[PDB]
Amino acid sequence: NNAHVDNEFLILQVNDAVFPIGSYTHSFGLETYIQQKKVTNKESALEYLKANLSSQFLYTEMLSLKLTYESALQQDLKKILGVEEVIMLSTSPMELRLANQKLGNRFIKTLQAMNELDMGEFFNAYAQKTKDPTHATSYGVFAASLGIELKKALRHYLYAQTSNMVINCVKSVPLSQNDGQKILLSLQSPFNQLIEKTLELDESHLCTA
Amino acid sequence: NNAHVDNEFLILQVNDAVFPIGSYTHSFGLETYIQQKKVTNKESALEYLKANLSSQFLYTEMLSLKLTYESALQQDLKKILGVEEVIMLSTSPMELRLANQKLGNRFIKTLQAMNELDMGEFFNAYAQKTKDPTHATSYGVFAASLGIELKKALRHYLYAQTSNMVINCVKSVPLSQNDGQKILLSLQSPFNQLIEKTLELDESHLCTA
């Protein structure tokens, strides 16, 4: 039914910076740290990025991606909605809440506008009931529905979000293009640690960072 | 070694639109079709892309990537420079042959800037001796040098270039973002046919389109 669809390309397409889901929300803490003169060069940007990756980005976004992926495999919509409720309640202020929700809704809507892509009955049920979808959670359900391997879905999502964070630093600090590339390289070892950790964590760790 | 380096992440990084090598040059052969009202919608854009992908892009760019990858595994530098000579000599107009060179030169330099990345003896020797590098040929040597699988290298390069082409159509026709996503989805089957075809071609087909 998705005979004409190739997951190897589809994972690249939905993680492409150009995938049309409205405006982005990672540049949030950054602009504050720039005004505070806490992030003003390559070295300080890197430490900022590592700190962020291993706090809220791991314990909220990455972990939630995994939780909704695993629950989707068990057709457990209830747990998915519960994860989304926990995240919504731990998110402030209302502007970030609103934006994250917009991003979530846009991700789902963009998939759905591709009429020739069949997401399956479970995904479409999720799409109809979700109140506070996020990019990471709806992605988790997306990957589970199409049978994309978890470690691969994570790796691709992790790289894409981080790339967005770094290009944010390059523009806002600013940094040099090569500085951004050096940063992305040095983050590869943290990336795999992050992925390892994500697999060890369970729902009790959700939003604790 | 490259102990801290993960090819899984590096392949995403070098194919990111953010990789600072400058703008791709597929945009050159589309402006006329638009002006002349030949590419006007999603449908005619798809056809133009399919035609483009399976002509000059296949017989020059994708094939050249494959040929320098293969020669790199044999550590046959003479054959690599031979491929680049053929492309340089077959490329007009002058302006496009200069743009392509820059793009190729920028790819190599960007890699070299990342000092914590060890490209290895052969790639360094290629870097010292190349005269008319291109993005595709330099990328081929890069992929083989790091032990990245050929089909995977092709898939990532192909998707990235095609995303760029589609974005050009979206911006130029212009088209809606949704239409661009439908186009990329529709091209997944063609992508696989393009890759299997690439593996069947050899030097005797180089630049014959």
UniProtKB/Swiss-Prot annotation, chains A, B:
GO cellular component terms attached to this protein's record: cytoplasm
Record's subcellular location: Cytoplasm
GO biological process terms, semicolon-separated: metabolic process
Keywords from the named record: Chaperone, Cytoplasm, Nickel insertion, Virulence
GO molecular function: nickel cation binding
Disrupted gene: phenotype observed: Cells do not express urease.
Family under the similarity heading: Belongs to the UreF family.
Function (record text): Required for maturation of urease via the functional incorporation of the urease nickel metallocenter.
Subunit annotation: UreH, UreF and UreG form a complex that acts as a GTP-hydrolysis-dependent molecular chaperone, activating the urease apoprotein by helping to assemble the nickel containing metallocenter of UreC. The UreE protein probably delivers the nickel.
Name of this protein: Urease accessory protein UreF
Species assigned in the record: Helicobacter pylori (strain ATCC 700392 / 26695)
Lineage start: Bacteria, Pseudomonadati, Campylobacterota, Epsilonproteobacteria, Campylobacterales
Name of the encoding gene: ureF
